[PDB]
Design an enzyme around this catalytic site. Structure first.
Site, PDB file in Angstrom:
ATOM      1  N   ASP A 293       4.177  17.466  12.351  1.00  0.00           N
ATOM      2  CA  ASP A 293       4.552  17.124  11.039  1.00  0.00           C
ATOM      3  C   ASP A 293       2.856  16.882  10.468  1.00  0.00           C
ATOM      4  O   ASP A 293       2.434  15.943  10.068  1.00  0.00           O
ATOM      5  CB  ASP A 293       5.849  16.128  10.220  1.00  0.00           C
ATOM      6  CG  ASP A 293       5.727  15.478   8.448  1.00  0.00           C
ATOM      7  OD1 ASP A 293       5.482  16.730   8.253  1.00  0.00           O
ATOM      8  OD2 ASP A 293       5.476  14.751   8.915  1.00  0.00           O
TER       9      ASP A 293
ATOM     10  N   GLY B 102       7.454   3.043   6.667  1.00  0.00           N
ATOM     11  CA  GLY B 102       8.360   2.027   6.103  1.00  0.00           C
ATOM     12  C   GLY B 102       7.331   2.102   5.143  1.00  0.00           C
ATOM     13  O   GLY B 102       6.717   2.257   4.479  1.00  0.00           O
TER      14      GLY B 102
ATOM     15  N   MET C 131       0.658  -1.250  -0.295  1.00  0.00           N
ATOM     16  CA  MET C 131       0.304   0.541   0.284  1.00  0.00           C
ATOM     17  C   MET C 131       1.273   0.789   0.459  1.00  0.00           C
ATOM     18  O   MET C 131       1.436   1.502   0.644  1.00  0.00           O
ATOM     19  CB  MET C 131      -1.275   0.094   1.349  1.00  0.00           C
ATOM     20  CG  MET C 131      -1.588  -1.536   1.524  1.00  0.00           C
ATOM     21  SD  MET C 131      -2.686  -1.371   2.581  1.00  0.00           S
ATOM     22  CE  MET C 131      -3.751  -0.265   2.370  1.00  0.00           C
TER      23      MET C 131
END
Ligand code: J0B
EC number: 2.7.12.2
Length: 276
Positions: free
Chosen positions: A141, A30, A24
């Site tokens: 973030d 990662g 995906m």
């Protein structure tokens, strides 16, 4: 705790009990696989951390997992279902979400309705407030790519790999010394208009120039945006970090309190956008 899939039903399983249905997305924290539990048929997301991988990428994966495990009681953070540690890899079982807000924006090919952004704002604020209060974690973030939605209408944050105790969503006080809520305001203006407010910049520093020099990118007043939406964004986009309100004040905003009670059909809107 490794070797357990707690998807309230804990199964003593290994990595071989999962069928790989493909990867995906790409990159970011990662490598995330879509895997199916052969015992039950359930489909989950699985992060793979290679022992031989980049030491800097593995450092962020372990930090993300540390935050995810600490947040097992936050409804607006993706839950970890277990871990599998082998001699070569670490497999992190995460709950399967549909997609991020960035991909919703691209498939929508236009503005995302305010009622969807209202349920999203409540989820992300409480997620950031949860990380600050119960754990002292600052996200650092917040972006549409970190806002995941699913088929049931849930909205959660996902990536905490660079958190602690990208540059285009950065707060003014981060460039020149509540910084996570400036990133939320930029994300809201982007999703509410379908246009990124700094798409004209060609470099990362030019965005930092526009953030400090130009006025905050406020919501347009001719798209039917409610006054509560425009007020909440203006509060988030306060340039001086001292005037910017804290989380206990943002959680009392009329735009937040409205969508805490309102029943928005995020699930049906999600499937209709996914079908486009
Ligand atoms: C926009 C989202 C995206 O591109 N992306 C990068 C690839 C992985 C993907 N993703 N990370 C996690 I943790 C996921 C879960 N739990 N479900 C679905 N997709 C997920 C985020």
């Amino acid at each position: 705790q490794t070797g357990y899939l707690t998807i309230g039903q804990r199964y003593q399983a290994e990595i071989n009990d999962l069928e790989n249905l493909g990867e995906m997305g790409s990159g970011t924290c990662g490598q995330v696989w879509k895997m199916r539990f052969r015992k039950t048929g359930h489909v989950i997301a699985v992060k793979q951390m290679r022992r031989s991988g980049n030491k800097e990428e593995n450092k962020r994966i372990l930090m993300d997992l540390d935050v995810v495990l600490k947040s097992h009681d936050c409804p607006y953070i993706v839950q970890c279902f277990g871990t599998f540690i082998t001699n070569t890899d670490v497999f992190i079982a995460m709950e399967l979400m549909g997609t991020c807000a960035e991909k919703l924006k691209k498939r929508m090919q236009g503005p995302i309705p305010e009622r969807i952004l209202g349920k999203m704002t409540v989820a992300i604020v409480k997620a950031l407030y949860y990380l600050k209060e119960k754990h002292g974690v600052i996200h650092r973030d917040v972006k549409p790519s970190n806002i995941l939605l699913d088929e049931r209408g849930q909205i959660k944050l996902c990536d905490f790999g660079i958190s602690g105790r990208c540059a285009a969503y950065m707060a003014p006080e981060r460039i020149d010394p509540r910084a996570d809520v400036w990133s939320l305001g930029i994300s809201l203006v982007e999703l509410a208009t379908g246009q990124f407010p700094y798409k004209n910049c060609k470099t990362d520093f030019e965005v930092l120039t526009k953030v400090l020099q130009e006025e905050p990118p406020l919501l347009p007043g001719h798209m039917g945006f409610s006054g509560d939406f425009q007020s909440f964004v203006k509060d988030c986009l306060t340039k001086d970090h001292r005037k910017r309100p804290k989380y206990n004040k943002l959680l009392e905003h009329s735009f937040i309190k409205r969508y805490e009670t309102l029943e928005v059909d995020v699930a049906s809107w999600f499937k209709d956008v996914m079908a486009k």
